[PDB]
Amino acid sequence: SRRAKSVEDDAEGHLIYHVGDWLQERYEIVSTLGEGTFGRVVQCVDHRRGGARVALKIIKNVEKYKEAARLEINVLEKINEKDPDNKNLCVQMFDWFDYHGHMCISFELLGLSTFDFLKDNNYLPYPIHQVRHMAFQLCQAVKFLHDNKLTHTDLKPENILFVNSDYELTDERSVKSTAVRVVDFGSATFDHEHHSTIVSTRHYRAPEVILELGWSQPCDVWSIGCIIFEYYVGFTLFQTHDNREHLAMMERILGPIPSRMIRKTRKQKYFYRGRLDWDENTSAGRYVRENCKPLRRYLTSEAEEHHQLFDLIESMLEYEPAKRLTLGEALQHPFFARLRA
Amino acid sequence: SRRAKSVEDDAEGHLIYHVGDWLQERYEIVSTLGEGTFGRVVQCVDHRRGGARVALKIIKNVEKYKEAARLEINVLEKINEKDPDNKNLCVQMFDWFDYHGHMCISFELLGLSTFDFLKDNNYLPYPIHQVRHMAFQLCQAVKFLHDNKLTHTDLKPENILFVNSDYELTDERSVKSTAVRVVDFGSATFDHEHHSTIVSTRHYRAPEVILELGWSQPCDVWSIGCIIFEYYVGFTLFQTHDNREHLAMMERILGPIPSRMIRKTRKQKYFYRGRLDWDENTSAGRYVRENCKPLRRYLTSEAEEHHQLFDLIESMLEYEPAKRLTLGEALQHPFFARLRA
Ligand SMILES: O=C1N=C(NCc2cccs2)S/C1=C\c1ccc2ncccc2c1
Ligand SMILES: O=C1N=C(NCc2cccs2)S/C1=C\c1ccc2ncccc2c1
């Protein structure tokens, strides 16, 4: 057990349980699989379902998380409605229910997340062939969403789970099968619905989000680019928590922000004389410059297949959303020629 | 640098800085002293003030934390107004200012918190003489607040700082001087002001708070009891994050909740047939019973001075706020006879 640290702790709002407890006279809690701001996920044995091992996501007993979970539920319903055979690469929901205020969602039991595998492997990056397969699947998965007028908005390695994270050793861990699925549709959004102003986890937030110019499907593609990169080098592309620094970092890695965007943003405070307001010759300046570099310098190799990866990444991190690569285009990219046939 | 984990991370809203930076052409940031939900505290050299080392509390650039900080500021102003010579045992604020949205407060540089000293010492508890001195000062400090129509509402070991945490070794750490001060008046509340429904950090939350019956000065005294205990055994008295469990724990440790309170609470969901709704013969039941016991069983010793401590604690954890020990009574308690003369 852990120490609460404030009047409003993540520790609050959870459902108490102990291994061996049953829910709805049906799910036997076997073990806890993880915790997130939303709640906990627990491994259960489903007894109205053969003994099948499932992943139960138990949501906090709080209005905001419960709202998000009701929204997540019908996003999952509309997913099963458009892909009965689970060929779409989004996680399969079995059932859901309110449990004394805690929304509960049952999913097929998967493996470790692509983040947690990495972390548990000392942030040693995935080999390129594995990055290719993973990236490919991630694009299919999210294109499916995009086709049905959805935007996930919170794509990140923790929300991409290996179907099975069994691995081999060498002193280094290597996953046996890079089959993956996309999870967490709590923030997912249809085109007709209200859009939150701020929408992604910092490291995967797209510039149009930062500058509140509006967002839609393209901001996912930005997230995807940032993930592919992370998979390839093993650390986040934008390690920052401040808007101005984040923008400073983009500029350095990607080149300058288009004035159209600078001019149109209500977030005018980060700009002076028409450019980003950021002195490179301060300590903050020194920090960004010392801690990141132009995108193409992160290449491990000179081989073509590596350069092809970075062309893909480079297109996904296009500043201007309308010019940014779509995921349809993404699946046609040279980098993926092997995996298509 | 650390990984953001959600759309709304603690990592967000902070002010970027680097050691060596100056603020207001005055404070030279020397080192970071810690982080909390509110912001960061940094050690600075004040150059409009002799070179004095101060603790600068830099608040996030966010409406809720900034509101709390404006409130914290005038609570500190009214404290200097009623005790010019800093004899009151609350921390001394030197100055404050808005810095591009970040409220900044300057304090005398103190030492490690009573929690962090403990933690850094493997949760080995403070000897009783030290507990006595600490408890005594904590009571004076908060009585001062109580006298001037205040309630801190967030008393906890992290908010009680040693003036100087220099220590001697033996394999065990022992602080050389148990002089302490009370910090963090972000949640502090006058009697005429609006009272938040929920007000303390879980482990120090008073039953009248949990059951939303109203609260005022007495709920601090509850917190204080819980702290004294923690100081004496080295771990929290109520290790829980759920209301019903928490109430279950109280009952076991303290005896049964007064029906008056059960009956009057709008939080009627935790009660059936007039008592707490809690089956002791479930696993949850088994957990509470196995993980805590009646208050007086935590005694390390049989000596009178130990029993005296527990009479004090026992009175501070009176269920009924009006019957609960006041801090005036507290300072007169037998346990403190040594320290008075
Ligand atoms: O719908 C979901 N949202 C998630 N959030 C990812 C997390 C982030 C931080 C802690 S968990 S997990 C999830 C469902 C989910 C589905 C199947 C699983 N199988 C094995 C292990 C975990 C699993 C989690
Ligand atoms: O007004 C305040 N509220 C605080 N909150 C306590 C924390 C809790 C978690 C991280 S910091 S510290 C504080 C002021 C404060 C004042 C003097 C100090 N001297 C040395 C070291 C730290 C210091 C912090």
Helix axes B304-316, B218-233, angle to 10 degrees: 150
Q: How far is CA B219 from CA B71, B150, B153, B206, B236, in A?
A: 20, 12, 7, 5, 17
B271-280 contacts at long range (C-beta below 8 A, 24 or more positions apart)? B276/B244, B276/B247, B276/B248, B276/B251, B277/B244, B278/B244, B278/B247, B278/B248, B278/B251
B180 DSSP assignment: E
The C-alpha R_g of chain A, in whole angstroms, comes to 21
User: Residue A229: beta bridge partners?
Assistant: none
How far apart (Å, rounded) are the C-alpha atoms in residues A254 and A318?
Answer: 8
How far apart (Å, rounded) are the C-alpha atoms in residues B60 and B8?
Answer: 13
A213 and A269 Cβ atoms separated by less than 8 Å: no
Assign residue A51 a region: left if phi > 0, alpha if psi is -120 to 50, beta otherwise? left
Q: Rounded to 5 degrees, what are φ and ψ at A259?
A: -55, -35
A285 is in an annotated binding site: no
Q: Do B5 and A284 touch (CB under 8 A)?
A: no
> What is the token pair recorded at B120?
């850094």
The C-alpha R_g of chain B, in whole angstroms, comes to 21
Please choose from A32, A57, A153 the residue to mutate so as to test ligand 1's pocket, defined by most ligand atoms within 8 A of CB: A57
- Ligand with smallest separation from the Cα of A92: 1
* Closest Cα in chain A to B157: A5
How far apart (Å, rounded) are the C-alpha atoms in residues A314 and A318?
Answer: 7
Cα B217 to averaged position of ligand 2 atoms, centre (Å): 23
* Cβ of A288 below 6 Å from ligand 1: no
> What is the token pair recorded at A90?
């989004």
Q: Do A4 and B202 touch (CB under 8 A)?
A: yes
Q: Do A37 and B6 touch (CB under 8 A)?
A: yes
A38 is in an annotated binding site: yes
Residues B143, B147, B151, B157, Cα dihedral to 10°: -20
* Active-site hit among B154, B220, B242, B277: B154
- Ligand with smallest separation from the Cα of B10: 2
Neighbours of A195 (CB within 10 A): 14
Q: Which residues of A touch B158 (CB under 8 A)?
A: 5
* Cβ of B183 below 6 Å from ligand 2: yes
Please choose from B31, B54, B57, B119 the residue to mutate so as to test ligand 2's pocket, defined by most ligand atoms within 8 A of CB: B57
- Ligand with smallest separation from the Cα of A79: 1
How far apart (Å, rounded) are the C-alpha atoms in residues B171 and B168?
Answer: 11
A208 and A218 Cβ atoms separated by less than 8 Å: yes
DSSP E strand stretches across chain B: 22-23, 27-36, 39-46, 53-59, 93-99, 102-108, 150-151, 160-162, 167-168, 174-175, 180-182, 189-190, 271-272, 275-276
How far apart (Å, rounded) are the C-alpha atoms in residues B209 and B321?
Answer: 10
Assign residue A50 a region: left if phi > 0, alpha if psi is -120 to 50, beta otherwise? left
User: Going by DSSP bridges, is the β-strand pair B22-23/B27-36 parallel, antiparallel, or unpaired?
Assistant: antiparallel
Secondary structure (DSSP) of A194-235: PPPSS-S-GGG--HHHHTTS---THHHHHHHHHHHHHHHHSS
- Which residue has the CA at smallest separation from atom 11 of ligand 1? A36
How far apart (Å, rounded) are the C-alpha atoms in residues B246 and A321?
Answer: 50
Sign of the CA dihedral running A161, A165, A170, A171:
positive
* Closest Cα in chain B to A158: B5
* Closest Cα in chain A to B237: A3
Determine the 3-state secondary structure of A93 from DSSP. strand
* Active-site hit among A46, A154, A184, A220: A154
How far apart (Å, rounded) are the C-alpha atoms in residues B38 and B56?
Answer: 13
Neighbours of A67 (CB within 10 A): 13
> Is B154 tagged catalytic?
yes
User: Residue B328: beta bridge partners?
Assistant: none
Strands in B102-108's sheet, in edge-to-edge order, are B22-23, B27-36, B39-46, B53-59, B102-108, B93-99
A299 DSSP assignment: -
Residue by residue, what is the 3-state secondary structure of B57-92? EEECCCHHHHHHHHHHHHHHHHHHHHCCCCCCCECC
How far apart (Å, rounded) are the C-alpha atoms in residues A271 and A244?
Answer: 9
Q: Rounded to 5 degrees, what are φ and ψ at A34?
A: 165, 170
Determine the 3-state secondary structure of B259 from DSSP. helix
Provide the residue count of chain A: 341
**What distance in Å separates residue A163's CA from the closest CA in chain B?**
22
- Ligand with smallest separation from the Cα of B158: 2
A295 DSSP assignment: G
DSSP E strand stretches across A145-255: 150-151, 160-162, 167-168, 174-175, 180-182, 189-190
How far apart (Å, rounded) are the C-alpha atoms in residues A269 and B70?
Answer: 23
> What is the token pair recorded at A210?
């930062």
Assign residue A3 a region: left if phi > 0, alpha if psi is -120 to 50, beta otherwise? beta
Sign of the CA dihedral running A299, A300, A304, A310:
negative
A39 and A46 Cβ atoms separated by less than 8 Å: no
CA proximity to A326, closest of A193, A134, A200, A151 = A151
Q: How far is CA A273 from CA A210, A262, A276, B100, B190, in A?
A: 19, 10, 8, 19, 47
A114 and A157 Cβ atoms separated by less than 8 Å: yes
CA proximity to B1, closest of A279, A131, A249 = A249
* Cβ of A34 below 6 Å from ligand 1: yes
Q: Which technique?
A: X-ray
User: Residue A42: beta bridge partners?
Assistant: A32, A56
Determine the 3-state secondary structure of B341 from DSSP. coil
Interface A:B, Cβ pairs < 8 A: 80
How far apart (Å, rounded) are the C-alpha atoms in residues B44 and B41?
Answer: 10
How far apart (Å, rounded) are the C-alpha atoms in residues B330 and B220?
Answer: 12
| Side chain identity, residue B96 | W
Resolution in A: 2.9
Helix axes A218-233, A304-316, angle to 10 degrees: 150
> What is the token pair recorded at A131?
């990055």
B24 and B99 Cβ atoms separated by less than 8 Å: yes
B64 and B106 Cβ atoms separated by less than 8 Å: no
By 3-state DSSP, what share of chain A in percent is helix, strand and coil, each rounded to 5?
40, 20, 45
- Angle at Cα B319 formed by Cα B315 and Cα B322, nearest 5°? 80
Secondary structure (DSSP) of B132-188: HHHHHHHHHHHHHHHHTTEE-----GGGEEES---EE-----EES---EEE---SS-
Domains annotated for chain A, with CATH where assigned, are 1-86+91-109 (3.30.200.20), 87-90+110-341 (1.10.510.10)
How far apart (Å, rounded) are the C-alpha atoms in residues B137 and B118?
Answer: 18
- Residue A289, classified by CB atoms within 10 Å of its CB into exposed (0-12), middle (13-18) or buried (19+), is middle
The per-type count for chain B, helices as H runs and strands as E runs, is 11, 14
| Side chain identity, residue A285 | G
User: Residue A27: beta bridge partners?
Assistant: A23, A46
Q: Do B36 and A9 touch (CB under 8 A)?
A: no
Cα B136 to averaged position of ligand 2 atoms, centre (Å): 21
Q: Which residues of B touch A203 (CB under 8 A)?
A: 3-4
How far apart (Å, rounded) are the C-alpha atoms in residues A92 and A112?
Answer: 16
* Cβ of A33 below 6 Å from ligand 1: yes
> What is the token pair recorded at B11?
């990592």
Determine the 3-state secondary structure of B168 from DSSP. strand
> What is the token pair recorded at A291?
């801690």
**What distance in Å separates residue A150's CA from the closest CA in chain B?**
18
Which residues have C-beta within 8 Å of that of residue B257, sequence separation ≥ 6?
B207, B247, B250, B251, B275, B276, B319
> Which residues does B contribute to its contact with A (CB < 8 Å)?
1, 3-9, 11-12, 14, 16, 18, 20-21, 36-37, 154, 158, 187, 198-203, 236, 239-242, 244-245, 283-284, 287
How far apart (Å, rounded) are the C-alpha atoms in residues A158 and A83?
Answer: 24
Sign of the CA dihedral running A205, A208, A210, A212:
negative
How far apart (Å, rounded) are the C-alpha atoms in residues B121 and B126?
Answer: 10
Q: Rounded to 5 degrees, what are φ and ψ at B270?
A: -90, 10
* Cβ of B30 below 6 Å from ligand 2: no
Q: Euclidean distance between the first and final Cα of chain A, in Å?
A: 51
CA proximity to B118, closest of B241, B37, B233, B40 = B233
Residue of A35, A61, A241, A267 best to disrupt the B interface, most CBs of B under 10 A: A241
> What is the token pair recorded at B304?
């009178």
Q: Do A11 and B241 touch (CB under 8 A)?
A: yes
* Cβ of A183 below 6 Å from ligand 1: yes
A204 and A222 Cβ atoms separated by less than 8 Å: yes
**What distance in Å separates residue A283's CA from the closest CA in chain B?**
7
* Closest Cα in chain B to A286: B18
User: Residue B34: beta bridge partners?
Assistant: B41
* Closest Cα in chain A to B8: A201
How far apart (Å, rounded) are the C-alpha atoms in residues A186 and A62?
Answer: 14
| Side chain identity, residue A325 | L
A336 DSSP assignment: G
B242 and A16 Cβ atoms separated by less than 8 Å: yes
Determine the 3-state secondary structure of A201 from DSSP. coil
DSSP E strand stretches across A63-159: 93-99, 102-108, 150-151
B195 and B215 Cβ atoms separated by less than 8 Å: yes
How far apart (Å, rounded) are the C-alpha atoms in residues B117 and B174?
Answer: 9
